[PDB]
Structure 1
Amino acid sequence: SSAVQYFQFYGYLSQQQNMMQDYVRTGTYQRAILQNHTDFKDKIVLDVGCGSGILSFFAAQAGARKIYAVEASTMAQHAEVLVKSNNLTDRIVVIPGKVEEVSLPEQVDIIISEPMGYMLFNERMLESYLHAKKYLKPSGNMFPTIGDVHLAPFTDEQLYMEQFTKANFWYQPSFHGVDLSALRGAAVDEYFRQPVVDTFDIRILMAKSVKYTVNFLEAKEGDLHRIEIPFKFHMLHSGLVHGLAFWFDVAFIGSIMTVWLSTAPTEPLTHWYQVRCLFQSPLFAKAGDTLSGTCLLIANKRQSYDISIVAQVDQTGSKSSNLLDLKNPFFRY
């Protein structure tokens, strides 16, 4: 139902084009595959959620002997057209359906995919990627191999105030004669439930990031149903902490070289941008204080996660929580 919409979203060539036009994304995948040609020459490769098939062609440019491209949306029909018109019907085989349901005729030497949603984990496609390892030969590789999530406290008073400014629409005792003000708190709540997807100046960050690593070769599908990310930040600056910023890097660890794709705010912008989660109430922290807590991600049935963030300044005991709905963010860009 929710999944109906998820796969229809990816049936649009315009959504494929948005990702293809991300040059950092598309070019880094090309370079990771090509410059690791020994991982692909004459190999059998599985492309999980191939969309238009761009990754499958990159594996063919690298010399792969057979490429199974699995795609569940109507986009599979468009990739088929592309395979024929590029004369690769020998080397690339499009398989319509979910990776969890299709039948592959052999095991593969390497799995390739672009399974990262914003904040990495949205869409829960990492689980389909991990599930595909049931087709991975022993000692096969995964491209990408590693994913690092980073989180860091930020201060951004204008972003925080923007929330009450939008919800104060409801604080009118006479909107065309109607008292709206009893909904103001519900409206505040609704805005704070949304992660804020856009980029930002790195001068809002107040501590070195915490890194949480998922190893795609080692992880199991079940390991992503619940992601506990403890953190303890040593605050490099004093200020009001308004929430946590998130970005992610992935690594393609090939035989020839390791290529990184970063969505860090210190790196060229990508179509993933970065993600920020506001706290209920900001926390005052001195430089030298430690800010500790947990960011808990609980998979849900809308192909996404409920996000629970609890934090406290250890030196004073002031704490804040928040609960966010990652499926429904504010695309502030």
Structure 2
Amino acid sequence: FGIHEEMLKDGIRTNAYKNAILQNKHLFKDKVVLDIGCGTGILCLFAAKAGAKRVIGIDMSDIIDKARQIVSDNGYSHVIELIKGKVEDIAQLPFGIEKVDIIISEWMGYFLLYESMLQTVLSARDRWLRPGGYLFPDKCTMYICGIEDSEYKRDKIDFWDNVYGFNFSAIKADALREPLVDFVESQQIITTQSKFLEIDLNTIQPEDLKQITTSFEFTSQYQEYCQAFVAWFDCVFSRGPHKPVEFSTGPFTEGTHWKQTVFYLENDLPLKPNDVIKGTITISQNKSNHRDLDISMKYTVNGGAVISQDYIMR
């Protein structure tokens, strides 16, 4: 419902897709395009306008009936075909199509990986993408840095110390375990930014997603307290477009509906300039609710004792 208006009115995202598709008419001309999660159909309309021979959109949502009407009203009912259901439940693609040239998708979730459609996109790639075909977009990179956020930490974590006189501190751990999806101001960042994960749809395999172990490293720029780490991702249309097309969900550029992801620290870090925060982040589907993401960090400051903290986004 409102999720579709939010996706469309996300200008940064829809403009990046618009540019990647419409500026590459040469690449789309007379091609067969599969779009995973077409929603109201704007990306399918772009691909058709770019000259695709056939655009197949899959959405599991009941929006499909209205999306077909939109396709008709814009004169593309002979080019764009919409199908309901899960990729995994599709007997065949329509019109006897066996392979496709280009897969468009918007699979990225919050924190890139939370409730994402990555596995669906990889199944569709494995089933239908012709050798050498293109994935729009194909590369996402995750970044992390440290911030000052004493005010929000006091309002959101320490609030539970005293609630109308009552001790609610039993809840504090749970509040700390939940990453926050929200915007951070760039002036709050007190460290360099660390690339810590890349996901390349051209080469990644589903078994690689079972448990992601990765490392990160960033450096303090200030004499300051660090209350939280913040993470975001960048997304690149790399293989396919004539020039690479990119957009960011970070705090130095226009906001997106993904916002940023804030991981509050149990114990604030007292940082000096040039202090080094380095560690590992392990990401995996939660073992009791498969929709939940377990995110475990272990790290040090200048090689001190290891600090560990576990989070679950749910």
Common topology (TM > 0.5): yes
**Which deviates more, 161-170 or 100-109?**
161-170
* Residue 290 (structure 2) pairs with residue 297 (structure 1): no
| Aligned counterparts of 2:171 and 2:164: Cα–Cα separation in 1 | 10
Contact kept, 8 Å, 1:53 with 1:79, in 2: the verdict is yes
2:307 matched to which residue of 1?
Answer: 320
Residue aligned with 1:100, SS: helix
Which 4+ stretches in 1 moved above 3 angstroms? none
1:75 matched to which residue of 2?
Answer: 63
| Aligned counterparts of 1:315 and 1:255: Cα–Cα separation in 2 | 43
After TM superposition, the structure 1 = structure 2 runs for residues 253-268 of structure 1, keeping only pairs within 5 Å, are 253=238, 254-268=240-254
Pair 1:206–1:324, CA change in 2 (3 A): same
Pair 1:255–1:164, CA change in 2 (3 A): closer
* RMSD of aligned alpha carbons: 1.7
Structure 1 residue 250 displacement after superposition = 0.5
2:132 matched to which residue of 1?
Answer: 139
Number of residue pairs matched? 305
Contact kept, 8 Å, 1:30 with 1:58, in 2: the verdict is yes
1:158 matched to which residue of 2?
Answer: 151
| Aligned counterparts of 2:304 and 2:177: Cα–Cα separation in 1 | 26
Aligned residue type for 1:249:
D
Structure 1 residue 55 displacement after superposition = 0.7
Choose which of 100, 103, 110 in structure 2 pairs with 1:118.
110
So what's the TM-score if we normalise by structure 2? Answer: 0.91
Residue aligned with 1:161, SS: helix
| Aligned counterparts of 2:98 and 2:223: Cα–Cα separation in 1 | 58
Contact kept, 8 Å, 2:145 with 2:230, in 1: the verdict is yes
So what's the TM-score if we normalise by structure 1? Answer: 0.86
Residue aligned with 1:303, SS: coil
| Aligned counterparts of 1:63 and 1:166: Cα–Cα separation in 2 | 56
Contact kept, 8 Å, 1:35 with 1:257, in 2: the verdict is no
Structure 1, residues 241-291: CA drift from partner, whole Å, max 9, x if none?
A: 222111111111234111101112111111111111011111222212211
Q: Which stretches in structure 2 are left out of the alignment for 5+ residues?
A: none
Contact kept, 8 Å, 1:279 with 1:321, in 2: the verdict is no
1:55 matched to which residue of 2?
Answer: 43
* Residue 89 (structure 2) pairs with residue 101 (structure 1): yes
Q: Which stretches in structure 1 are left out of the alignment for 5+ residues?
A: 1-11, 173-179, 328-333
**Which deviates more, 222-231 or 255-264?**
222-231
Contact kept, 8 Å, 2:158 with 2:172, in 1: the verdict is no
Structure 1, residues 304-328: CA drift from partner, whole Å, max 9, x if none?
A: 41111222213543x433222223x
1:208 matched to which residue of 2?
Answer: 192
Contact kept, 8 Å, 2:58 with 2:85, in 1: the verdict is yes
Residue aligned with 2:89, SS: coil
Structure 1 residue 294 displacement after superposition = 1.3
Of all paired residues, the percent bearing the same amino acid is: 32
Structure 1 residue 171 displacement after superposition = 7.3
| Aligned counterparts of 1:171 and 1:295: Cα–Cα separation in 2 | 37
Aligned residue type for 1:285:
L
After TM superposition, the structure 1 = structure 2 runs for residues 259-298 of structure 1, keeping only pairs within 5 Å, are 259-298=245-284
